[PDB]
Structures are given as C-alpha cells and as structure tokens.
Symmetry: C2
Amino acid sequence: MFDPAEKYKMDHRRRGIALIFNHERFFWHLTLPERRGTCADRDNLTRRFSDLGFEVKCFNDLKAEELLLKIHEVSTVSHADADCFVCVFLSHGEGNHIYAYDAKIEIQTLTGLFKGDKCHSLVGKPKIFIIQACSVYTLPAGADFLMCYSVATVNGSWYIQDLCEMLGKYGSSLEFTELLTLVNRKVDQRRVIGKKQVPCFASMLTKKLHFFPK
Amino acid sequence: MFDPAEKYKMDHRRRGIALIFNHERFFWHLTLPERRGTCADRDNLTRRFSDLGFEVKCFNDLKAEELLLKIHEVSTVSHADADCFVCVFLSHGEGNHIYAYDAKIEIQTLTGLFKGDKCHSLVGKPKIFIIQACSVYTLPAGADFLMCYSVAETVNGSWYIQDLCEMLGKYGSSLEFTELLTLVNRKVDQRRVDSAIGKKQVPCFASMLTKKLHFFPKS
C-alpha cells in the first residue's frame, strides 16, 4: 500500500514557528556592505507567513552567540502540536556559511539541530529553511528537510518579493514545491530568458506539502 | 497573465537522449572499490527511460577523455526536435566531482555544457542530471536544470535506482516528475527498519525547473 497523493498531516493545533533572522548591518572588521531593503524583505515574509498561520518571530542583526542561543532554544521547544517549522536567513553567505553580525556560522550547524535525533517533536514534519545569501550550497540535513536558495532595491530583493507574491496568491492552495517552481519562473522573467542561474530549492521532502487554511 | 499549471512543451518529435555513464571498475592507482550491481542499475534505467521514449545511450567504464568527448558530442548535437535531456552518472563521487575510470571530473564542467549559452537547442527545455555517487553537492547550472542525488549511505542494484525505477515504471508516464521524485524520497526512507524513519539523510533533488514536467506517452 503506497499513496502517490499522500500529503503531510497539517491538522495540528498550531502551524508552527516561522523564525526570521534579519541582518542589515555588520561588525566593522568584517568589511561587509550594508544590506539595504532587508527590513522590507523581513516585513514582507512576516506578513505572508502570518496569513499562512505561522507564529512569526523576528530577530534583527543578532550576534553569533545570540543567534545560536535562539535557534537552539527554538529547536528544544515542543513542536508536538505543530504542523511544520520555517527558518529564514537574510544575510551574506559564503559557501556553507551564513553571516551573523560579528561572525559566520556553518549552515549545517544550524539545520542539524532539527534532525530526527535532536528534535523529536518534528520527526516526519516539514522543516523548511530559506536562505537569502549572495556554485555551492549545503545538502539538506535529512528527511523532510526543504532548503530554499535565492542564488543571488529598497523595496526588497527579487527572490523575496517574488516568493511573497506567490505565497500571498497561491500559498493557501498550491503544493509548496509547485509554488517554489513558480518563483523560479518569476525571477527568470526579470532578465529583460532561461540562460542564467535562477533561484533554487533542494527537497528531501517525502510527501506533498500544502498550507490549507486551518 | 501567469499560469500556475503551465507544463513544459513535451510535444516535440523526439523525447530526447537519455545518456548513461556506468562505472564499475576503476584504474588501479585510484584505490577505488569495484561497484557491484551498477550494471543492474544501468539496465534498470535503460529499460525505464526507453518506455518513457528516451533514446538511451550507454557507456561503460569510459576514461576521462572518452567521457568528455561524448558529453560534448551530445551537447553539440541538435536537440531542437527534442523534449528534454537526461544524463545519468553511476560512479564514485567526492564533493563536486564524479569519477571516470582514470580520474575525477568536476560536475559543473559537465553540466555547464548544456547551459543556455552553449546549448541553444535546449533553451527552455528540462535538463535532468541523475548523480549516483557516494554534506556537499553542486548547485544546478541554470534555469530548467534538475539535479537528482542518491545521497548514498546489493547485486540487484542500489536502493536509490531500484526505488527510482519502480516509481518511474509505475508513475513515470502520468505523475509530475518532482512528485515522482518526492515519492522516491519516501521509498528510500522506508528501507530503514534495522525502527524509526525520517531521522537520517535520504535522497535529494535540486530543482531550477520553471514549469511542471510530465512524460505523457507520445501519440
């Protein structure tokens, strides 16, 4: 017995936490340019994920310690009565690293916290990570992981604007990878096509993912 | 005007070439173990992609030169009357490298040949690469690229290919391709009974696709 149309069980009490790390300015000695319009991206995502029923928790220009303290805190909270988990990073990113205010951090250090072993209450539930960071990327940490990459302007970046537009229009009906595929096309249209690098998503998901209204 | 249900145009004369590089034995001084049952995987994929209408071209234990000559040859052929392109690598793989018989080759060197600039007759058409090679992977080369990874952790073949081919045989001619690939992720996840599932690394796919992809029978 095997069902091709089988969806994730999305009928828990809460949808889950939408965690957002927004980085605009950086420690001087890192020599990293200010990221104009990330607050626009952050507000845009908050809006969209809230209408999808997420509990959006925002954090601005956190230092490496404070960031690590918060994700671990979130990973050790009970998600038993939650559908899924969403984490977003809006910063600079070199290779397999994301940048905090003062230093860089390996992505798999962050995503590894939500693996089946460490985060039991999220086993079998979608774990979505969105990485908006300027050809390398780190492979999803395990089953039911979904990595979304921007693969990189005062109103925000193309990826987030186009993601949020689709999230706002189709988020509560379409299958999530369908919607993400649509973003790939929207960003491809900006080139005024289908010749250069667009946004990307790596899926270790095992079922269909929908965000039908609760 | 924007269509969420829009599919790739899959009504060209031919489906396209399914290119398979099967590596079983390796040059001695590479110190790489023989890959038992890759010929089983190779035969399995040939079977499946043929029923899907692909022109399957197989190459066994090719050396770095011969491999590079063939992919370039395939990339410079006209795909104007083709739906899409499929390339499969069955070998050992360290980081962003795949192994030929004698040496390793960067994946993006291979996939870069089918980018919009170099391969004009495949612009806007799906370019599917399947990598069966023992957490790093190289990002898809551009729009309409789809990378499929085994993420390996057995004489009839490997779990990934068996499970992929089973799904290809059962749902290949009807389901959307990423749907089907998602199903493979679940099938490989079930294998862990030696028990709790959905805890460890499963197979993966990175999609730069821009439309829905179906392999409906050509009539």
